[PDB]
Amino acid sequence: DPGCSELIQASSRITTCSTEGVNTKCRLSGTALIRAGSVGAEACLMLKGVKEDQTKFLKIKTVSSELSCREGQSYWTGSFSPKCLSSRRCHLVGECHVNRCLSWRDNETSAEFSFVGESTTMRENKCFEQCGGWGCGCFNVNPSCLFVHTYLQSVRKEALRVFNCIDWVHKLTLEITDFDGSVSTIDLGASSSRFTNWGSVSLSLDAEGISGSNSFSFIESPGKGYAIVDEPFSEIPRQGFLGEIRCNSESSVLSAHESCLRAPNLISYKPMIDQLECTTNLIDPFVVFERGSLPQTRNDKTFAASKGNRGVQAFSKGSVQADLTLMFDNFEVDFVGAAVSCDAAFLNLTGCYSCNAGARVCLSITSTGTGSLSAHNKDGSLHIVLPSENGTKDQCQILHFTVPEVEEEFMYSCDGDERPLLVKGTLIAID
Amino acid sequence: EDPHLRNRPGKGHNYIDGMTQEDATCKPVTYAGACSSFDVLLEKGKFPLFQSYAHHRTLLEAVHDTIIAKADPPSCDLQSAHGNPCMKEKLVMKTHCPNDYQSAHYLNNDGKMASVKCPPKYELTEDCNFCRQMASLKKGSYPLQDLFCQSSEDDGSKLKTKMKGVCEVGVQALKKCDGQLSTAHEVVPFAVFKNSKKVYLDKLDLKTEENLLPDSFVCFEHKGELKSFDISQCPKIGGHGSKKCTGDAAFCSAYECTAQYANAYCSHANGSGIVQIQVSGVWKKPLCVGYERVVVKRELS
Amino acid sequence: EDPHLRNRPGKGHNYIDGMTQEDATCKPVTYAGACSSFDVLLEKGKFPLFQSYAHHRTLLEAVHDTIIAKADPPSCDLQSAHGNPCMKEKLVMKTHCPNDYQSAHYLNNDGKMASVKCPPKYELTEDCNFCRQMASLKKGSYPLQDLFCQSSEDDGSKLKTKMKGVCEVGVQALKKCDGQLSTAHEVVPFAVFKNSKKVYLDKLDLKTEENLLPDSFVCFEHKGELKSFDISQCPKIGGHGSKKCTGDAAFCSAYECTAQYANAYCSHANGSGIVQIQVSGVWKKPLCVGYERVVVKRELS
């Protein structure tokens, strides 16, 4: 919903006016500070040149208050399924020895299991021993060797990214509208700065934050809701704990790439002459994802996901007190003369005064051409910016007042000529 | 190549029907001769399974020894667009082979012997799937599969491919996948039985039984022609036998060594012996187990 | 890797009208060809943009593809009379043209192929603006810009250079600055769409979109070796086309392989995909996007 709350004026020290082709244009190259509104309020910026009928609004719509989290350490994990292969060889046959299978290197591939080829997969090479004699398939009295080649592969068609948050950044999801009519949706948190087509914007004051996030780990799911775990971050993988096999990307887990980590001595083996049963006790994070699925009520806030951009946020029921810093890098602002004229009519007025909700004004714009209605009061403290087109449409914005008996006269102009207009309506006390 | 591993028991024939222009050096297969149907099997870094198991038989050698039957047609005439049976069985396989080739044989779906044929003067591409026009060509048949053949009569016709979450792999048509499948080229071993189909196995367990069994050793006619010679006809310790035989410490530890009176030469090297494999949860004796790189279609979404 | 540093999709003509002296060889541009108008772009340490987009078209090929207009005259003469249109844009540039060259091509304000030339025997100076009497003599031209084009059809005639701080860049007079004017030579990108002007940019943000495109395939012509071949002639699945062409498996999975009837070996590559551009907050397909080396006139506060 539209409605510029705070109203400021462009200073003459940062405004350069000129004339090109009988068109008075202005150039902004400075810094203008303004206080950010609450949920629904805005912070318009009107440009003034050498006359009074030339006005270019800079509407900045505020969606709502959000508390983004700063992601630090992160790792991918998921379920897997071991697939080991066995191949017993006789003693003194190729590489079948009693002293070689015991001290076998895990990062070395023997000539027995070298029949597949190149494969980037988290694989290992064990070395077990069996008995000899003709009772199990052997010719020499010395014990034989049982080479085991086990590789890990993903059994489930999905992965989860377990990460944490070091600080909760109060992100302000804004919606800056350019002078020509281009609408851009950006976001500002704590003291971050973004870049647009007219310069840059950042914050100035941020008095809102949630402490105590290092002892909480989050889990990202491919569009199936996030989760929260009540334990500190896991940096050392070990057995008997959630987080023993990690990696670095989703493709490294779904396709099982050798660029991940795993706990040593985790894959259990059952040597039975020539049999093999690769059974692992992998900790499945799906149970934790089910028992700790968002939303989860903690203390007095609400933790959920985020809209538009992928990320974790936090809902807060507090006040919104922040400022805005508008930077300008020699931006050209032109004005052709708006459009045609148009008639306006009052409808209704409801809402509140001296509160964050505001008062909703009802106006009926009736014109014949596509334009924008620019109204103003007497002392230059209120303005109405509503779109206009051919036909009779009902528009309105959010206004703020300090008196329940609003009796202020407005001066609306569709193309330069102003007309008197009086509004009225009672309000209720709210903060 | 290694000339010591050129000994092939049995008849040792490696030639395809229809195109019998290469049989002067490959019928039989001896230590001499220049045939591309066998010299490529001894290359280092290409087919290590044949180097590890060199005392057994191959595909064509098993066909000429009444083990593996012939397909229909045995030689896929690659002179038209599709139509021939040797088409979809080759488009699904991904085997690397050099140029200057003509014929190539592999294992089909029914466990028989299927191959292709290129009439003069044509050759094959860089993969062997199609052909093209064009130094001198090799009249031999490049083996596309890396399997070993053995003499056995183990029953097993009601056993097919039973993998874990695989749509279509190789030439087998398992279950359909309505969602997005994971098309990738992987190496999955196979195993053929007696009058069965191509059975793929994900978790393979190789068994090597090398002991006092007659099929655990290898022997050939040699002084103190080159064909096969059975070991049960050798003499015993302190007794009398039909035909004498000599060897090393492994052969002399159980039998005797006559040297000048021996008409053959036995040895105990890595490449012979009764070999089993796991299938359907039990142990069975296969007939041709190898490694191939085909298109493995796994589930995803 | 990039094994297609000299492959040119489509036509492949690279010569400026009016100054044609090496067209008898660079039509088309193959791996064994010799053309000084294209080998400069492949030099390591000059134009890194074309080094990254090695598998992409340029500007001259876009002129020969009948998708963009050409300047009149396309070859400006530096030794004619007073009133040369190819001077107000060349004198404001800052380039380093080496010796053994007498021609230079670039893009004008109207978005047309505008180039200059010098009759023998006169070579350019150290910057390529003037000329003097000077080892060899290349029969081509020298690229002055670092741009690239494609088969774009998006309209962009309703756009204009919207830059901040800069008062007048190149030959386009944006706004009039009355304060302190800074004269410096920097790199300012530009964007030319279908039937548009030279719209300069501030922060170029490209985007690659390659998801199964017909232009992402190269067919190696059969030669016994390597030889270029046109890939825009392979039919679809059971469709029709010009000539015949086949490939391995990835190339035959989308097209039709005619076995021995084809005379080209296709493969799978990338680089010639759909290139996007960031302008007006909406991703579009650019037609003449690159970088400039003109003077930058900024207004100080």
CSV table of C-alpha atoms in Angstrom, one decimal, chain C:
chain,number,residue,atom,x,y,z
C,1,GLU,CA,41.0,-26.8,-23.3
C,2,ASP,CA,38.8,-25.2,-26.0
C,3,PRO,CA,39.5,-27.4,-29.0
C,4,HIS,CA,37.6,-25.1,-31.4
C,5,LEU,CA,39.7,-21.9,-31.4
C,6,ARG,CA,39.3,-21.5,-35.1
C,7,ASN,CA,35.9,-23.0,-35.8
C,8,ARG,CA,33.4,-20.5,-37.1
C,9,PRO,CA,29.7,-21.4,-37.0
C,10,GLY,CA,27.5,-20.4,-39.9
C,11,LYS,CA,29.1,-18.7,-42.8
C,12,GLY,CA,32.5,-17.6,-41.6
C,13,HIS,CA,33.3,-14.6,-43.9
C,14,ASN,CA,35.6,-12.0,-42.3
C,15,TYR,CA,36.4,-9.2,-44.7
C,16,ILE,CA,35.4,-5.5,-44.9
C,17,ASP,CA,33.7,-4.4,-48.2
C,18,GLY,CA,35.9,-2.0,-50.2
C,19,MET,CA,39.2,-3.3,-48.7
C,20,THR,CA,39.2,-6.9,-49.9
C,21,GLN,CA,42.7,-8.4,-50.4
C,22,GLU,CA,42.7,-11.7,-48.4
C,23,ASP,CA,39.1,-12.9,-49.1
C,24,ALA,CA,40.4,-15.6,-51.5
C,25,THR,CA,41.6,-17.6,-48.5
C,26,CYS,CA,39.4,-16.6,-45.5
C,27,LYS,CA,36.2,-17.9,-47.2
C,28,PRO,CA,35.5,-19.7,-45.0
C,29,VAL,CA,37.9,-19.5,-42.1
C,30,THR,CA,39.2,-23.0,-41.3
C,31,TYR,CA,41.9,-24.4,-39.1
C,32,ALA,CA,44.6,-24.3,-41.8
C,33,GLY,CA,43.5,-20.8,-43.1
C,34,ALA,CA,45.6,-17.6,-42.8
C,35,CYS,CA,43.8,-14.3,-42.2
C,36,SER,CA,45.3,-11.3,-40.4
C,37,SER,CA,41.8,-9.9,-39.7
C,38,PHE,CA,41.0,-12.8,-37.3
C,39,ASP,CA,44.4,-14.1,-35.9
C,40,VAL,CA,44.7,-10.8,-33.9
C,41,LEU,CA,41.6,-11.7,-31.9
C,42,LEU,CA,43.2,-15.0,-31.0
C,43,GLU,CA,46.3,-13.4,-29.6
C,44,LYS,CA,47.0,-14.2,-25.9
C,45,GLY,CA,47.3,-10.9,-24.1
C,46,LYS,CA,45.1,-8.4,-26.0
C,47,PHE,CA,41.3,-9.1,-26.0
C,48,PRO,CA,40.4,-11.4,-23.1
C,49,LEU,CA,36.7,-11.2,-23.9
C,50,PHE,CA,37.1,-13.0,-27.2
C,51,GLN,CA,39.4,-15.4,-25.4
C,52,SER,CA,36.6,-16.3,-23.1
C,53,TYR,CA,34.1,-16.4,-25.9
C,54,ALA,CA,36.3,-18.3,-28.3
C,55,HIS,CA,33.4,-20.4,-29.5
C,56,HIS,CA,31.2,-17.3,-30.3
C,57,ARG,CA,30.7,-15.2,-33.4
C,58,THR,CA,32.0,-11.7,-33.9
C,59,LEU,CA,30.8,-8.5,-35.8
C,60,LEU,CA,31.9,-9.2,-39.4
C,61,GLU,CA,30.2,-12.5,-39.4
C,62,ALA,CA,27.1,-10.8,-38.1
C,63,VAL,CA,27.4,-8.4,-41.1
C,64,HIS,CA,27.7,-11.3,-43.5
C,65,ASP,CA,24.7,-13.0,-41.9
C,66,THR,CA,22.3,-10.3,-43.2
C,67,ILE,CA,21.2,-9.5,-39.7
C,68,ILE,CA,22.7,-6.0,-39.4
C,69,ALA,CA,23.3,-3.1,-41.7
C,70,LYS,CA,26.7,-1.8,-43.0
C,71,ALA,CA,28.1,1.7,-43.2
C,72,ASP,CA,28.4,3.7,-46.4
C,73,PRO,CA,31.1,3.9,-47.3
C,74,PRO,CA,32.3,0.8,-45.3
C,75,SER,CA,36.0,1.5,-46.1
C,76,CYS,CA,36.9,5.1,-45.3
C,77,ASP,CA,39.8,6.7,-47.2
C,78,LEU,CA,42.4,8.7,-45.2
C,79,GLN,CA,43.9,10.3,-48.3
C,80,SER,CA,40.9,11.8,-50.1
C,81,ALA,CA,39.8,15.3,-49.0
C,82,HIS,CA,38.4,17.2,-46.1
C,83,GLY,CA,35.3,15.8,-44.5
C,84,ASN,CA,36.0,12.2,-43.4
C,85,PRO,CA,33.2,10.8,-41.1
C,86,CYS,CA,35.6,8.2,-39.7
C,87,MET,CA,37.7,10.7,-37.8
C,88,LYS,CA,35.5,12.2,-35.0
C,89,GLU,CA,35.2,8.7,-33.5
C,90,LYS,CA,38.7,7.4,-34.3
C,91,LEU,CA,40.6,10.5,-32.9
C,92,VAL,CA,38.8,10.2,-29.5
C,93,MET,CA,39.9,6.6,-29.1
C,94,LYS,CA,43.0,5.3,-27.3
C,95,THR,CA,44.4,2.2,-29.0
C,96,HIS,CA,47.8,0.8,-29.9
C,97,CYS,CA,47.9,-0.5,-33.5
C,98,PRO,CA,51.1,-2.4,-34.3
C,99,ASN,CA,53.1,-2.1,-37.4
C,100,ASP,CA,52.6,-4.1,-40.7
C,101,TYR,CA,49.0,-3.0,-40.9
C,102,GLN,CA,47.2,-0.4,-42.9
C,103,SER,CA,43.5,-1.0,-42.1
C,104,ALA,CA,41.3,-0.8,-39.0
C,105,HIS,CA,37.7,-1.7,-38.5
C,106,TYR,CA,35.3,-0.8,-35.6
C,107,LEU,CA,31.7,-0.1,-34.9
C,108,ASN,CA,30.2,3.4,-35.5
C,109,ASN,CA,27.5,5.2,-33.6
C,110,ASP,CA,24.8,4.0,-36.0
C,111,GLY,CA,25.7,0.4,-35.3
C,112,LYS,CA,27.2,-0.3,-38.7
C,113,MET,CA,30.4,-1.9,-40.0
C,114,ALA,CA,32.6,1.2,-40.5
C,115,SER,CA,36.3,0.8,-41.3
C,116,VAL,CA,39.2,2.8,-42.6
C,117,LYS,CA,42.0,1.9,-45.0
C,118,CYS,CA,45.3,3.3,-46.5
C,119,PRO,CA,46.5,2.6,-50.0
C,120,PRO,CA,49.9,1.1,-50.5
C,121,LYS,CA,52.4,1.8,-49.4
C,122,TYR,CA,51.3,3.6,-46.2
C,123,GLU,CA,51.1,2.0,-42.7
C,124,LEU,CA,49.5,3.3,-39.5
C,125,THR,CA,51.3,5.0,-36.7
C,126,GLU,CA,51.7,3.8,-33.1
C,127,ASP,CA,48.0,4.6,-32.3
C,128,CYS,CA,46.5,4.0,-35.8
C,129,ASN,CA,45.2,7.6,-36.2
C,130,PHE,CA,47.6,9.0,-38.8
C,131,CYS,CA,49.9,7.3,-41.2
C,132,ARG,CA,53.5,7.2,-42.4
C,133,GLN,CA,55.9,5.4,-44.7
C,134,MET,CA,57.2,2.1,-43.3
C,135,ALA,CA,58.5,-4.7,-42.5
C,136,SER,CA,55.8,-6.9,-44.1
C,137,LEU,CA,52.3,-5.9,-45.2
C,138,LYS,CA,49.2,-7.8,-44.0
C,139,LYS,CA,46.3,-7.9,-46.5
C,140,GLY,CA,43.7,-7.6,-43.8
C,141,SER,CA,42.5,-5.3,-41.1
C,142,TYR,CA,43.2,-4.6,-37.4
C,143,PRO,CA,40.4,-5.0,-34.8
C,144,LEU,CA,39.9,-1.8,-32.7
C,145,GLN,CA,37.1,-3.0,-30.4
C,146,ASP,CA,36.4,-6.1,-28.3
C,147,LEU,CA,32.8,-7.0,-29.1
C,148,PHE,CA,30.8,-10.0,-30.2
C,149,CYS,CA,27.5,-10.7,-31.9
C,150,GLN,CA,25.0,-13.6,-32.3
C,151,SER,CA,21.6,-14.4,-33.9
C,152,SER,CA,19.6,-12.0,-31.8
C,153,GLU,CA,16.1,-10.8,-32.8
C,154,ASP,CA,15.1,-8.7,-29.8
C,155,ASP,CA,14.2,-5.1,-30.5
C,156,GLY,CA,16.0,-2.2,-28.8
C,157,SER,CA,15.4,0.9,-30.8
C,158,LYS,CA,13.6,2.6,-27.9
C,159,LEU,CA,16.7,2.7,-25.7
C,160,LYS,CA,19.3,5.4,-25.0
C,161,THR,CA,22.6,5.7,-23.2
C,162,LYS,CA,21.7,6.3,-19.5
C,163,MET,CA,25.0,6.9,-17.7
C,164,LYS,CA,25.7,8.9,-14.6
C,165,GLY,CA,28.7,11.2,-14.0
C,166,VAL,CA,29.9,11.0,-17.5
C,167,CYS,CA,29.0,14.1,-19.5
C,168,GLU,CA,29.9,13.0,-23.0
C,169,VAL,CA,31.4,9.6,-23.9
C,170,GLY,CA,32.5,8.7,-27.5
C,171,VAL,CA,30.5,10.7,-30.0
C,172,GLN,CA,27.1,10.8,-28.2
C,173,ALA,CA,26.4,14.1,-26.4
C,174,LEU,CA,24.4,13.1,-23.3
C,175,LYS,CA,24.0,16.1,-21.0
C,176,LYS,CA,25.8,19.5,-20.8
C,177,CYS,CA,28.2,19.9,-17.9
C,178,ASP,CA,29.0,23.4,-16.7
C,179,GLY,CA,31.3,22.5,-13.8
C,180,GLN,CA,34.8,20.9,-13.7
C,181,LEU,CA,35.4,18.6,-16.7
C,182,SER,CA,37.7,15.6,-16.2
C,183,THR,CA,39.4,14.2,-19.3
C,184,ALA,CA,40.5,10.6,-19.0
C,185,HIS,CA,40.6,7.4,-21.1
C,186,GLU,CA,38.8,4.5,-19.6
C,187,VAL,CA,36.9,1.4,-20.7
C,188,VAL,CA,33.2,1.9,-21.2
C,189,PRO,CA,31.0,-1.0,-22.5
C,190,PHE,CA,28.3,-0.6,-25.1
C,191,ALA,CA,25.2,-2.4,-26.3
C,192,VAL,CA,23.7,-2.5,-29.8
C,193,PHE,CA,20.5,-4.3,-30.4
C,194,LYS,CA,18.4,-4.9,-33.6
C,195,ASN,CA,18.3,-1.6,-35.5
C,196,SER,CA,19.6,0.6,-32.7
C,197,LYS,CA,22.4,2.9,-31.9
C,198,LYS,CA,25.6,2.5,-29.7
C,199,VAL,CA,24.0,2.5,-26.3
C,200,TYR,CA,26.8,2.6,-23.7
C,201,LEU,CA,26.6,0.8,-20.4
C,202,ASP,CA,28.1,1.1,-16.9
C,203,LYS,CA,28.2,-2.4,-15.4
C,204,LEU,CA,28.1,-5.2,-17.9
C,205,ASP,CA,26.6,-8.4,-16.5
C,206,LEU,CA,26.5,-11.4,-18.9
C,207,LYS,CA,24.7,-14.6,-18.5
C,208,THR,CA,25.2,-18.0,-20.2
C,209,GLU,CA,22.1,-20.1,-21.1
C,210,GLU,CA,23.1,-23.5,-22.6
C,211,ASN,CA,20.3,-26.1,-22.3
C,212,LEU,CA,20.3,-28.4,-25.4
C,213,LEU,CA,20.9,-26.0,-28.3
C,214,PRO,CA,21.5,-26.9,-31.9
C,215,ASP,CA,24.5,-24.5,-32.1
C,216,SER,CA,26.3,-26.5,-29.4
C,217,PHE,CA,27.6,-29.2,-31.7
C,218,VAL,CA,30.6,-29.6,-34.0
C,219,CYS,CA,30.9,-32.2,-36.7
C,220,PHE,CA,34.5,-33.3,-37.5
C,221,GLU,CA,34.8,-34.1,-41.2
C,222,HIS,CA,36.2,-37.6,-41.9
C,223,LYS,CA,39.7,-37.2,-43.2
C,224,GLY,CA,42.7,-39.6,-43.0
C,225,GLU,CA,43.2,-36.2,-39.4
C,226,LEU,CA,41.0,-33.1,-38.7
C,227,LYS,CA,38.9,-31.0,-41.0
C,228,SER,CA,36.2,-28.5,-40.4
C,229,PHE,CA,32.6,-29.1,-41.5
C,230,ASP,CA,29.3,-27.2,-41.4
C,231,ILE,CA,27.2,-28.5,-38.5
C,232,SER,CA,24.0,-26.6,-39.6
C,233,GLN,CA,23.1,-29.5,-42.0
C,234,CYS,CA,22.2,-32.4,-39.8
C,235,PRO,CA,18.5,-33.4,-39.8
C,236,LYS,CA,16.5,-34.0,-36.6
C,237,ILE,CA,14.9,-37.2,-35.4
C,238,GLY,CA,13.5,-38.7,-38.6
C,239,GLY,CA,13.4,-35.3,-40.3
C,240,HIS,CA,15.1,-33.9,-43.3
C,241,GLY,CA,18.2,-31.7,-44.0
C,242,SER,CA,20.9,-30.8,-46.5
C,243,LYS,CA,23.8,-33.3,-46.2
C,244,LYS,CA,24.4,-36.1,-43.8
C,245,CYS,CA,26.3,-36.2,-40.5
C,246,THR,CA,26.6,-38.5,-37.5
C,247,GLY,CA,28.5,-38.5,-34.1
C,248,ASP,CA,29.1,-40.7,-31.1
C,249,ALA,CA,26.2,-41.0,-28.7
C,250,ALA,CA,25.4,-37.5,-27.4
C,251,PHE,CA,25.3,-36.1,-31.0
C,252,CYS,CA,23.2,-39.0,-32.3
C,253,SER,CA,20.8,-38.8,-29.4
C,254,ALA,CA,19.3,-35.6,-30.8
C,255,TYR,CA,20.0,-35.9,-34.5
C,256,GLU,CA,19.9,-38.8,-37.1
C,257,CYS,CA,23.0,-40.9,-37.9
C,258,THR,CA,23.1,-42.4,-41.4
C,259,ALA,CA,26.0,-44.8,-40.6
C,260,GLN,CA,28.1,-45.0,-43.7
C,261,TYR,CA,26.1,-42.4,-45.6
C,262,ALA,CA,27.6,-39.7,-43.4
C,263,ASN,CA,30.9,-38.0,-43.9
C,264,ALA,CA,31.3,-36.2,-40.6
C,265,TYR,CA,31.9,-37.2,-37.0
C,266,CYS,CA,30.0,-35.1,-34.5
C,267,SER,CA,30.7,-34.6,-30.8
C,268,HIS,CA,29.5,-32.6,-27.8
C,269,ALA,CA,30.8,-29.2,-27.0
C,270,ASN,CA,29.7,-25.8,-25.7
C,271,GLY,CA,30.5,-22.1,-26.0
C,272,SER,CA,28.0,-21.1,-28.8
C,273,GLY,CA,25.0,-20.9,-26.5
C,274,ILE,CA,22.5,-18.0,-26.0
C,275,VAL,CA,24.2,-15.1,-24.4
C,276,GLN,CA,22.1,-12.7,-22.3
C,277,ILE,CA,22.7,-9.1,-21.2
C,278,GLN,CA,21.7,-7.0,-18.2
C,279,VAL,CA,19.9,-3.8,-19.3
C,280,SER,CA,16.7,-2.1,-18.1
C,281,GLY,CA,16.4,-4.8,-15.4
C,282,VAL,CA,15.2,-7.3,-18.1
C,283,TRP,CA,17.4,-10.0,-19.6
C,284,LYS,CA,17.6,-9.6,-23.4
C,285,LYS,CA,19.7,-11.0,-26.3
C,286,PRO,CA,22.3,-8.5,-27.3
C,287,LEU,CA,23.4,-8.0,-30.9
C,288,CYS,CA,26.5,-5.7,-30.7
C,289,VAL,CA,27.8,-5.7,-27.1
C,290,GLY,CA,31.5,-5.1,-26.2
C,291,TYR,CA,33.8,-2.5,-24.9
C,292,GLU,CA,35.2,0.9,-26.0
C,293,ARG,CA,38.5,2.7,-25.6
C,294,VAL,CA,37.3,6.3,-26.2
C,295,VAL,CA,37.8,9.3,-23.9
C,296,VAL,CA,35.6,9.7,-20.8
C,297,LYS,CA,34.4,13.2,-19.9
C,298,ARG,CA,33.0,13.3,-16.4
C,299,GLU,CA,31.6,16.3,-14.5
C,300,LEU,CA,33.2,16.9,-11.1
C,301,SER,CA,31.3,18.5,-8.2
